[PDB]
Amino acid sequence: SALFEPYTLKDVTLRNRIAIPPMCQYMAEDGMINDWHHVHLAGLARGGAGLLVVEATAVAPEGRITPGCAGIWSDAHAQAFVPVVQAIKAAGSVPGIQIAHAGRKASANRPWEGDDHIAADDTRGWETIAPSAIAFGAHLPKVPREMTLDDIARVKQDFVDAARRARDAGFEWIELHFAHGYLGQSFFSEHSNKRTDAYGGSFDNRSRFLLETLAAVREVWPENLPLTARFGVLEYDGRDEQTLEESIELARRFKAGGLDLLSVSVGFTIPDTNIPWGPAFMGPIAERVRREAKLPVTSAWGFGTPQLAEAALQANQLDLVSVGRAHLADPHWAYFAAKELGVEKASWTLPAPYAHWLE
Amino acid sequence: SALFEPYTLKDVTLRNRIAIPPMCQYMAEDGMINDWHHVHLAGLARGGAGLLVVEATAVAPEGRITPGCAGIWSDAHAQAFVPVVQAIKAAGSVPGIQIAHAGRKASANRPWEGDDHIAADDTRGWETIAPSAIAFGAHLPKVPREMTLDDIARVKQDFVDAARRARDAGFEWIELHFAHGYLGQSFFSEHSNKRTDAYGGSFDNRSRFLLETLAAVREVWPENLPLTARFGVLEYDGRDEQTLEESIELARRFKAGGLDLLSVSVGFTIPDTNIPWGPAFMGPIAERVRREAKLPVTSAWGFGTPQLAEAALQANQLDLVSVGRAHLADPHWAYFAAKELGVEKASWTLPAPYAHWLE
Ligand SMILES: Cc1cc2nc3c(=O)[nH]c(=O)nc-3n(C[C@H](O)[C@H](O)[C@H](O)COP(=O)(O)O)c2cc1C
Ligand SMILES: Cc1cc2nc3c(=O)[nH]c(=O)nc-3n(C[C@H](O)[C@H](O)[C@H](O)COP(=O)(O)O)c2cc1C
Ligand SMILES: O=c1ccc2cccc(O)c2o1
Ligand SMILES: O=c1ccc2cccc(O)c2o1
Ligand SMILES: O=c1ccc2cccc(O)c2o1
Ligand SMILES: O=c1ccc2cccc(O)c2o1
Ligand SMILES: O=c1ccc2cccc(O)c2o1
Ligand SMILES: O=c1ccc2cccc(O)c2o1
């Protein structure tokens, strides 16, 4: 099956096309990960997936989404990832990490603790920053502070330091979080970016923060290790054709700038939208980006059904299939998929201590 | 459903009736467990099972089944279990451990490395000990050395030290491995025990090693923590009625001796047998033992089908349902079962970081 064919990008080879997309656990303390993450990630790596991308890890304290988000804004924070990275590699999976900055969606409660912006008097909260002083709305009403040019320079450097730390911690795959309405996505979208300086207005100006951050990270990230990003290419806000055209153009600039693969998603920049949720609904859009930008891609949402994952790959809509929630339900989803697709010696998708007894 | 009703034994309360039986991983080095076990066990504990019994852990070096078996024959070996025990508890599952001695089945290769007795010239091998100098046969042809009274005293003390270490490491449930043809089972069976001293011949003499070991362990194992054992009650060797009668009588002596629960299994003492393998095939025998010995029991083999587990409990054939291989296939089997049985808020069988998104 196509789902179980290896994939090589730069000097890295994934044993199959199954990728576990970044999934926040909200279990870190002051940005420091712990045994929750170690067992969670090591267990997933042993499950069989070819690539395991660690959850959105903040490049700065205020870049966290919640008080439970992981961070890599200091060398001590990076050190915490070392044993985890080594456990993922020992399991045969490729360790990746998504570095991010929540922007105006920062300083929010954990999903099961309100999922809304933290109250002004809560000692855990903090001031959010963004391209412009405009709130997301809905459950995230906090108005962020408009970033100064110095804030921009500082955040870009935070991304560079985060990438440098990821590199030294042993990660072999990096993903810049430019999607889901967080800082990067918000600089590109006219909904959230009303700036009149070099970082707002035109397509080039709105693209600037993302392109400069990618270029800056590229200086410290090894050429032989996949350099990727997640980016929302449309919002389903009634401006889809225009937005997709601009997003694809930016994807072309990313490719020219050294991006090896693009994780295609939706913007989630504003709440007033009408997203046509459905199993593998992103397939068609991902394929269009892959084709018009001539860049490898991955996407997600509902690919937890083996046959769907297989079909998406065979149709060349995606290069890697990202499966998220199915892996929270069953860390050994790769094994379940191998069986479902009739892969020979499907049990050996898992380590010997398990495989021997399941064959 | 009955599968998800809590269970209290002594001072310990299991959140449900799902027990993960001991399952050797063959990943230890010189008896020392490592991160394979830590992630494996912690992951299983987070999966939802109410009780997690750690694999057969050798009370002495020669008591290991293979060079990859876990051991607890020294305080350093016990220390290795401390972080694991604490991770299991943090997950809400009860940490248990099966202490054992492989007897004549010791010094064998890992299952995926031959599964047979290690060659005489292999530097990893060792002399096996047993009640009598008689080999198992088949793939385990090595003739063990007949134990002296001093060997018996020493092994009993090894079990005591192992239990004392398990206690101090934080385990809240202990299981003496008197089944599957290893040392304990071999002392009870006339197939393997041809001794003429106080430890062989009569029912009382063949029961002696097991009863004395239980009594000795009882002196160091807390009264408020479940004291259990796994025991093969029949062999399917043509002497079933006679063997079951004696096994049930020994179970009565175990109960009188402080045993809180008995894990009912098959002897596997010799290779020439005809075991009627089938889903939940042990159910009827387990029920007979539970009834005639008036002792709580658990059993296993094929209970990985939610409905079967539920049925066994409702029929009072078992008090706890042991599910093994299904947990190797899917560490979150408890979640799969909760869904299958229509349990309310089935996703919360798992921790919040997973449950929130699966509901
Ligand atoms: C708990 C949870 C945490 C997530 N965390 C992240 C994240 O940190 N970064 C990101 O880009 N997407 C994140 N996502 C979105 C997932 O990566 C994925 O695209 C989404 O779950 C859809 O795929 P699925 O249907 O296979 O779950 C998360 C989703 C869930 C359910
Ligand atoms: C890998 C593996 C390791 C096992 N290790 C042990 C052990 O250490 N001690 C024991 O008493 N039984 C052991 N067993 C037997 C299991 O506890 C259980 O009774 C058996 O797998 C039948 O249940 P199942 O059909 O749910 O897998 C093992 C079985 C497997 C497959
Ligand atoms: O699409 C999603 C859903 C949940 C989520 C959570 C944290 C960060 C993200 O980027 C997320 O993206
Ligand atoms: O892209 C680069 C630049 C410098 C460098 C130096 C050492 C090892 C690498 O992998 C490197 O990769
Ligand atoms: O891309 C880079 C740039 C600098 C560098 C320095 C040391 C090791 C690396 O792997 C590096 O990689
Ligand atoms: O029934 C079984 C099957 C495998 C096994 C492996 C180690 C120890 C045991 O007690 C076992 O018991
Ligand atoms: O059974 C016993 C005997 C002594 C003892 C001492 C401290 C704590 C315990 O739980 C104990 O339990
Ligand atoms: O059963 C026993 C016997 C002795 C003992 C000693 C300390 C702590 C315990 O928990 C103990 O438990």
PDB file of C-alpha atoms in Angstrom, chain A residues 25-27 35-36 38-40 42-43 46 87 111-112 325 328-332 335 348 350-354 356-358, chain B residues 25-27 35-36 38-40 42-43 46 87 111-112 325 328-332 335 348 350-354 356-358:
ATOM      1  CA  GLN A  25      -1.205  18.408  25.488  1.00  0.00           C
ATOM      2  CA  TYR A  26      -1.529  21.430  27.808  1.00  0.00           C
ATOM      3  CA  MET A  27       0.531  19.518  30.391  1.00  0.00           C
ATOM      4  CA  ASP A  35       6.949  12.739  31.945  1.00  0.00           C
ATOM      5  CA  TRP A  36       3.497  13.311  30.504  1.00  0.00           C
ATOM      6  CA  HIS A  38       7.912  11.741  27.406  1.00  0.00           C
ATOM      7  CA  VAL A  39       5.572   8.758  27.705  1.00  0.00           C
ATOM      8  CA  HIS A  40       3.016  10.266  25.335  1.00  0.00           C
ATOM      9  CA  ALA A  42       7.655   7.758  23.081  1.00  0.00           C
ATOM     10  CA  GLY A  43       4.485   5.664  23.070  1.00  0.00           C
ATOM     11  CA  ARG A  46       6.603   2.998  19.080  1.00  0.00           C
ATOM     12  CA  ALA A  87      13.344   7.910  22.821  1.00  0.00           C
ATOM     13  CA  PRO A 111      -9.618  23.518  26.421  1.00  0.00           C
ATOM     14  CA  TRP A 112     -11.237  21.635  29.316  1.00  0.00           C
ATOM     15  CA  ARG A 325      -7.094  12.268  17.093  1.00  0.00           C
ATOM     16  CA  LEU A 328      -4.950   9.848  20.896  1.00  0.00           C
ATOM     17  CA  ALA A 329      -7.625   7.140  20.799  1.00  0.00           C
ATOM     18  CA  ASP A 330      -5.118   4.424  19.830  1.00  0.00           C
ATOM     19  CA  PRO A 331      -1.357   5.148  19.921  1.00  0.00           C
ATOM     20  CA  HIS A 332      -0.891   2.088  17.709  1.00  0.00           C
ATOM     21  CA  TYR A 335      -0.769  -1.044  13.296  1.00  0.00           C
ATOM     22  CA  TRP A 348       5.783  -5.738  12.701  1.00  0.00           C
ATOM     23  CA  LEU A 350       5.245  -2.429  16.079  1.00  0.00           C
ATOM     24  CA  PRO A 351       8.402  -3.372  18.060  1.00  0.00           C
ATOM     25  CA  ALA A 352       9.257  -7.059  18.596  1.00  0.00           C
ATOM     26  CA  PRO A 353       7.879  -7.221  22.191  1.00  0.00           C
ATOM     27  CA  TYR A 354       4.449  -6.592  20.679  1.00  0.00           C
ATOM     28  CA  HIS A 356       5.867 -11.317  17.875  1.00  0.00           C
ATOM     29  CA  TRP A 357       2.614 -12.002  19.718  1.00  0.00           C
ATOM     30  CA  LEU A 358       0.215 -10.258  17.359  1.00  0.00           C
TER      31      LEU A 358
ATOM     32  CA  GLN B  25       8.764  -7.828  27.440  1.00  0.00           C
ATOM     33  CA  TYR B  26      12.193  -9.510  27.264  1.00  0.00           C
ATOM     34  CA  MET B  27      13.764  -6.032  27.189  1.00  0.00           C
ATOM     35  CA  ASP B  35      12.838   3.116  29.429  1.00  0.00           C
ATOM     36  CA  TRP B  36      11.239   0.365  27.382  1.00  0.00           C
ATOM     37  CA  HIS B  38       8.745   2.763  31.806  1.00  0.00           C
ATOM     38  CA  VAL B  39       6.972   3.973  28.666  1.00  0.00           C
ATOM     39  CA  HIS B  40       5.268   0.627  28.093  1.00  0.00           C
ATOM     40  CA  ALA B  42       3.034   4.173  32.008  1.00  0.00           C
ATOM     41  CA  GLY B  43       1.298   4.150  28.629  1.00  0.00           C
ATOM     42  CA  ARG B  46      -2.971   5.888  31.133  1.00  0.00           C
ATOM     43  CA  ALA B  87       4.048   6.912  36.899  1.00  0.00           C
ATOM     44  CA  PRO B 111      10.488 -15.823  21.884  1.00  0.00           C
ATOM     45  CA  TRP B 112      11.589 -14.164  18.631  1.00  0.00           C
ATOM     46  CA  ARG B 325      -2.586  -9.124  23.924  1.00  0.00           C
ATOM     47  CA  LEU B 328      -0.248  -4.771  23.217  1.00  0.00           C
ATOM     48  CA  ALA B 329      -2.274  -4.091  20.067  1.00  0.00           C
ATOM     49  CA  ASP B 330      -3.980  -1.030  21.589  1.00  0.00           C
ATOM     50  CA  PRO B 331      -2.768   0.392  24.934  1.00  0.00           C
ATOM     51  CA  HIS B 332      -6.098   2.217  25.167  1.00  0.00           C
ATOM     52  CA  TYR B 335     -11.364   3.130  26.026  1.00  0.00           C
ATOM     53  CA  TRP B 348     -12.967   9.958  30.040  1.00  0.00           C
ATOM     54  CA  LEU B 350      -8.554   8.321  29.339  1.00  0.00           C
ATOM     55  CA  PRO B 351      -6.759  11.400  30.780  1.00  0.00           C
ATOM     56  CA  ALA B 352      -8.052  14.898  29.941  1.00  0.00           C
ATOM     57  CA  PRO B 353      -5.429  15.597  27.206  1.00  0.00           C
ATOM     58  CA  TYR B 354      -7.053  12.788  25.227  1.00  0.00           C
ATOM     59  CA  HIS B 356     -11.546  16.187  25.906  1.00  0.00           C
ATOM     60  CA  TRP B 357     -11.028  15.691  22.173  1.00  0.00           C
ATOM     61  CA  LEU B 358     -12.568  12.248  21.811  1.00  0.00           C
TER      62      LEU B 358
END
